[PDB]
Design a protein around this ligand. Sequence first.
Ligand SMILES: Nc1ccc2c(c1)c(-c1ccccc1)[n+](CCCCCCc1cn(CCNc3c4c(nc5ccccc35)CCCC4)nn1)c1cc(N)ccc21
Ligand SMILES: Nc1ccc2c(c1)c(-c1ccccc1)[n+](CCCCCCc1cn(CCNc3c4c(nc5ccccc35)CCCC4)nn1)c1cc(N)ccc21
Lengths: 533, 537
Amino acid sequence: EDPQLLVRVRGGQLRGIRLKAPGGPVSAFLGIPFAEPPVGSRRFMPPEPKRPWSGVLDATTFQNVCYQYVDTLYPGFEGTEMWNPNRELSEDCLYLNVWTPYPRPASPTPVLIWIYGGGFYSGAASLDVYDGRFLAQVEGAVLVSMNYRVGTFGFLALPGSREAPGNVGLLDQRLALQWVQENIAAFGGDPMSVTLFGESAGAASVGMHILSLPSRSLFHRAVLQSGTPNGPWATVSAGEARRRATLLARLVGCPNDTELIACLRTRPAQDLVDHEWHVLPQESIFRFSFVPVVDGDFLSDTPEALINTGDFQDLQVLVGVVKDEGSAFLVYGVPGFSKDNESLISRAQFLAGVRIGVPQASDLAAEAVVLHYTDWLHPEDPTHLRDAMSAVVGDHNVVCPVAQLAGRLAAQGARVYAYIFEHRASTLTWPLWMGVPHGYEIEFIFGLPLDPSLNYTTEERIFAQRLMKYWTNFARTGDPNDPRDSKSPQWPPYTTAAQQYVSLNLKPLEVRRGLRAQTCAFWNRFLPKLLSA
Amino acid sequence: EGREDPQLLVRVRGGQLRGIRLKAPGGPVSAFLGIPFAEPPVGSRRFMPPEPKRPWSGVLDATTFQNVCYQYVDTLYPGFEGTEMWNPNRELSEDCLYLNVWTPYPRPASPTPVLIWIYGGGFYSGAASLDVYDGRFLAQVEGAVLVSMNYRVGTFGFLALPGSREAPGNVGLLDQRLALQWVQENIAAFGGDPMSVTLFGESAGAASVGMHILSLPSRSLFHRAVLQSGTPNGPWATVSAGEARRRATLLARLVGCPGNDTELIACLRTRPAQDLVDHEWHVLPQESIFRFSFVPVVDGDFLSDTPEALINTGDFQDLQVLVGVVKDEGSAFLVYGVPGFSKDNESLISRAQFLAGVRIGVPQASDLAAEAVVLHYTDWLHPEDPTHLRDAMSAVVGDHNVVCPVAQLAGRLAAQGARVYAYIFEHRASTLTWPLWMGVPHGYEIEFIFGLPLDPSLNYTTEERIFAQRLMKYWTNFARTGDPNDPRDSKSPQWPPYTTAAQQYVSLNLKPLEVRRGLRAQTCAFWNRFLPKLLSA
Ligand SMILES: Nc1ccc2c(c1)c(-c1ccccc1)[n+](CCCCCCc1cn(CCNc3c4c(nc5ccccc35)CCCC4)nn1)c1cc(N)ccc21
Ligand SMILES: Nc1ccc2c(c1)c(-c1ccccc1)[n+](CCCCCCc1cn(CCNc3c4c(nc5ccccc35)CCCC4)nn1)c1cc(N)ccc21
């Protein structure tokens, strides 16, 4: 029995497993319960802390993935399957995983806590792209990820009710955060040095933790990759959630809130997932049925209100986007798009595609979008029309909300660093026209190209190393710059005056100004005034 | 008759004229200045359509420019060449309907292509006698017959009670048409070809050329057209019948005229010319720049529908147009109403002065539209930078009034069978007295088209002299053939037609012709396609 793989946490003894990383061994503790399984009468309810256990809990293995929709658009295809559950689905899924160096760190080590994306309807901390072994081995980081409930199970809300208050998936994350505070020292983590990081919905989740006071004493720094609490998709109003929850009930035979919720709780999990999409108010892409709600509790006002009025002086934030935020979403509903062909679209297809990417837009607002995104020298050119449709979706959903947050945090005293990620993986299975799609930086940050068997290029393995350094340096210090590297160029902070950001690609850091400033002026300043009237 | 130059005696429908041998650098030219083409539109004829000049006995002396039509005289900068050069340089009179003819000397043995100039000045000012409109150079160097007319401006030209007998509107355009009919009947006496007549004009002159293109009775009087920095469509060149009624009535009220149209017009008639000029500007509905009180009216007669509708549905297969703009259409308008702007300092404005400037530059915008304008013109990297704000103000005014209205004239005419040629003029005169920040202001290419730099005593650079010769060649090549390109000249780069598919136009500067694509395509899609729709809802 290996003494390095035996840990005593607050609720009992754990046994981890030594994993092999290319440069040496790592200690992994997989599938640690941090909450009472949210099953039966606990469905839709806030999580409760996990009861103590006897003897030694087996923590050598990933545990169930929270019950969620499984993608079937391209069955067998790697570009989609890599996001699909890789363990058994179950409502019994409140488990976290910890990777540490081997042997366990000698002194307290910065902790990085990963929160997965998946539109708040999917994701798992067990996916191959979130593998913590590389960051633990190379940078000596303690890396943590938690499963948290998604779709109806994490976010179905009848706001104001006791038994479905909304946001329980965010409370799952928060409980994992407290678990880290209480237990990470046992693993050689420094609970005084926790950095959240996340992508897509995970990034929005990180942002929500920023904007919720009870979460604020559970971390120091945050990294938001391709997502934000503000923006069109990450939240819904109380009114809208009540509507969706009510409508879902109606669609599954149910039936006051109590009666309604009790009958929802009698329903098989797959019955809820079956009808999950039918509650969206409009035909759309980049919209999700069950997402955090503005409840006046976890979130005391809209993310927009909270970012305009917050005090962020104590905060360090790393934010960024990938080069092609919207391209991969187009094949999930926009007529004319497929991964299997070059998706050259007509102008008609372009206006039509816009009403789906900007579901809330009036005829005028949509016209405004089309006019601002048309290339007036070749208005009919099908490659630009395709690329523009992709940029409409990316800008509206990710880039401009990010610019807005970077914002914003900078204006209210936060230290902010921003990037755009422009390297396309040589191993990528989506077609070339999609460029560098939403989600495709993650493998680089986690250090997957260091696994010689995945055959990334040599250049990409160097690049992954640089990225792991920025992230862990940032975790360590709140500054992504290498504090011993006296040869340039430096990653400067994002400020509202200079709006400086960096491109992460194969070439050395390039400093740029304005994160599509002109385009985001439209989306953040003009579009809202236009929908108003 | 017989002691004077036998080569300066010509007869026209109205009688005998004596003109004058003028000196140009290359040699002599014949000029016939001050030829009456209409009965003086004075007295009971104020606001009425012009009546054809009645024949005279004896030899009319045609050796000097004649009266300028009654108009506002600029005073913002006394003694300053930049404003004075546009001010009247003969006496102000309602009796002002005269035209001018420059021909080679001796007059051409064979019928020569005719160029007809129509001056600009917002429809409230202008004169065919200004130094910058001097025909001698085109006449001498290009062998051109150049004709230019006075037409009535301000109230006298454009004050209208639409539907009435006594003030039908558009009479200043009718003055211009009467001069065109005069060229048809008489220009052969000077050795001009009435079957080869080109109109050309800048600013309001260009809009006038455009109205002639759009008005059927005018279409038989000329044969191509050149519009410099002006269009008949756009926010300033016309007014609805309703709005013209409103302005006439308000001005009537401001000069103490009180209720049908006959009394009202009779009382206006009545008023001293100077009193009308004194109150002209007071009828504008909002605080504004690039708006003028009395302009062509959509009467359902001269203009059968709005210019916008006429260019969308007209057939233009037989038409050849040269159109274009200068680099800085709006800059010189800013000193005439936008707080913060002056000719005597750098005009570095604040962000507040910009939002305030937009409401004046786009007087018709709701709050929403003005916000769109600001958003589209702010540089979001440096949103408070006073140089950019200054230059954006200029661009807003220039884009909205000239560049983008030109941009469709070109597009619509080309979509509908015209042969169109397009230019942006980018050379700043070395002699210019406006400040540097104003760049190449509205009106400042005319000088070069007319060949003024060929006058050695004017202090233009040698390259400017070559430059003017080129432009003159382009313009007269176009008059001559409908094609600015030199047929003979294999070497020199070619000026392609403007098409909807390729949107080609040329830079006119000291460098050889460079072909560019899309005339502010991205920005003009805002003003011509989006702004209107925003202004509805
Ligand atoms: N006929 C039906 C019935 C039910 C559902 C349907 C369709 C669909 C659907 C399938 C194909 C086309 C349109 C719609 N859907 C799917 C719509 C979801 C579309 C989002 C897919 C997407 C695409 N991307 C960008 C590229 N990278 C990723 C992904 C995926 N996940 C992630 C997660 C994190 C980061 C990146 C990433 C998953 C899919 C592929 C690419 N992110 N997310 C359902 C979903 C439900 N929750 C419930 C029911 C149904
Ligand atoms: N207090 C008063 C009283 C009466 C009038 C006043 C002001 C003004 C005014 C003057 C200064 C500032 C604001 C308003 N105005 C306004 C006149 C100013 C508007 C036009 C100025 C302008 C500026 N540009 C651009 C530069 N190039 C030119 C010009 C001018 N003319 C031309 C004509 C053709 C081509 C070019 C060109 C004239 C002046 C300066 C430059 N063109 N025109 C009046 C007008 C009237 N018809 C009657 C009365 C009054």
